[PDB]
Amino acid sequence: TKRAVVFAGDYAYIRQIETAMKSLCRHNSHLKIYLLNQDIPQEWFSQIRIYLQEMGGDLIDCKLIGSQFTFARYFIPDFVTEDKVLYLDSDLIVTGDLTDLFELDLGENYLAAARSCFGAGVGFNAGVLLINNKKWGSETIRQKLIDLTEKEHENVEEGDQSILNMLFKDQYSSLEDQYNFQIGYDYGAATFKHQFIFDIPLEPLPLILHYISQDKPWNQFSVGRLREVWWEYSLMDWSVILNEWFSKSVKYPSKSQIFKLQCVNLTNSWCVEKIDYLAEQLPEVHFHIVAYTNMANELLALTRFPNVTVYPNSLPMLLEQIVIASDLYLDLNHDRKLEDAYEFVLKYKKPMIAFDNTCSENLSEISYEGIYPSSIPKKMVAAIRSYMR
């Protein structure tokens, strides 16, 4: 059975994130990792998802694209479905079996959280949270965290960590220091002459190393201890991690599914009739959605699907190569139709289909191999599948 973990980071931190995830996975099978992000490319998710699945888990691309949306942590209950989830920062390393941490009862607590810097900071450290997702959702904790941040964000040193403290004061149980061992405090410890911090044993290795502060181990120069450990995981090939688990008979089939069809549309509108439904309904079809300008969030968010490539600011000749490379044109876009498409559809004799509300006004029913009901799009799903061999 699957244990739920969540990270949040943009593509600029993909090296840290991937590493955090590598360490985690090294020592823990059956992980359903949810990754909140905005800009991480989809080829990365396709490949890493294969590995997670092979270890009896999964990888969920949670796109924070839309006006309703770094304070990504806040949105955890909007994406995560299980009752309990572990949030983890990306500037950190997992050194062993986290069973205890996973299997811990929160009771009526909103979350479990370790103290800031071994007792030196106020409150708890936000970098490891065993979260009661059921209660975060069913108590509207997301919107509460949002509204608390509008009301006073300046009056609070330390970002969303201070806000999570300010809301959950005395409403959290507490994790031991080794499940969020803030080795990155070293520079601050040394700064404030906290001599006994350097006396804490680093053998055996703490279960979670959290390299807080600006003094990061992956930088050129770092003064903090355990710099060498981050690099062990960062430079570890995924095949090392996997062969460990395929040595101890923990091996599952992936879903590296290949496409049985290549579909394309060119749009000059945010609205592409049933594109989301068609995407989820046809995993085996790569949809190519092209534009000549910037795209609105409703389309950019299609990055969440493994099987949809989106092309903002393309050009006619690039569209043309896609049409050549395609099996089927889907005439789904609403407002102004762009002529270049019909041109290329005729030119390379490409079949075309549409919905009753997305047909061209300045065109005729022989141009379409079928016109399908936009309120019964499963009929379009069956039509599309009929072009597969």
Next chain:
Amino acid sequence: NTKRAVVFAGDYAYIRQIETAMKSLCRHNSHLKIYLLNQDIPQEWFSQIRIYLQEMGGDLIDCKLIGSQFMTFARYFIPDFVTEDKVLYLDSDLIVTGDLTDLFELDLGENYLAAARSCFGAGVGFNAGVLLINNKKWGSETIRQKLIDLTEKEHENVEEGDQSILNMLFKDQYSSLEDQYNFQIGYDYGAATFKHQFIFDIPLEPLPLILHYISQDKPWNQFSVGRLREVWWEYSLMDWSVILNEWFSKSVKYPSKSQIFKLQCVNLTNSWCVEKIDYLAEQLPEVHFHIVAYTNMANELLALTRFPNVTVYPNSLPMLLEQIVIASDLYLDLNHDRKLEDAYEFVLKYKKPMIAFDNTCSENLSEISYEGIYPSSIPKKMVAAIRSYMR
């Protein structure tokens, strides 16, 4: 067999591009001595990747451009670092898809370089992203300085960074490379913009030997419009183990130089000058030297990142030094006066041997404090002394 010289140039921010480019090269070509011109790539990366290149009969050379004698123009300094008579320069925004022997073995004669044309002929001159360089002649004819002087003169009235200058100076003096050895597939947006339709009829089966993803439209961005996006990602996401296992099956497998340290040495400095530290690091690869300061460090010291066996710790603090001193075998009191008390306090307290050069002793705590004072003019004695503390 023997090694073919290759040089990349790029900073840490592009490490994902650099490493991918190096994976696609190594996937298809064994026995590569790779040089890499940079200022901020951490040593742990080099250490690990070096192991791989060597296992394939090659090597990886950290070419650190730290010091006022030197990054957008890193190419210029190729003939200061590279020692072979011929070297292949490569941009890091690119993929190698096969055997490059025809390129490596090409005779330049008296040509200073070989290059492919810019954008299939669309642009003026050659593209600077793949260069078969006559390094012997670049060195022997002071090309680095002329490139710097032609950049000093008329930098303001040229447009392509240092490709302009490269083309300005070598105009009518290079042999040509076929397009497939610098296939600028990244020109696709540009070729679509200016309606160069025939660009798009150039067949991409079989795959060009060198794909070069020029322009702001990169295949590794969230979105891009250019073709052959898939192939960059095929390499980026490939484990090094696949590359190595492919070679081992074709009987190409060399042992690595995995040196393991026999001693740990430390110094705290308040100056740029740490007596013989370069000499010492070179003579003593089996010794891990740790050089610490409480402030920024000068380039002479930051440059020590070139050695695989020296860690350098700018902006450290007393309690951090304390922990390095605890873990270490020997204190080398090499800094050039303005001795910081902390070192001597930690040295006594944890009962650490401490040696020095004749020109680098404290004036205060006299010659019983040092287990040996060695000659600064005969530093081979300090070397032999350091090894006598090994086990």
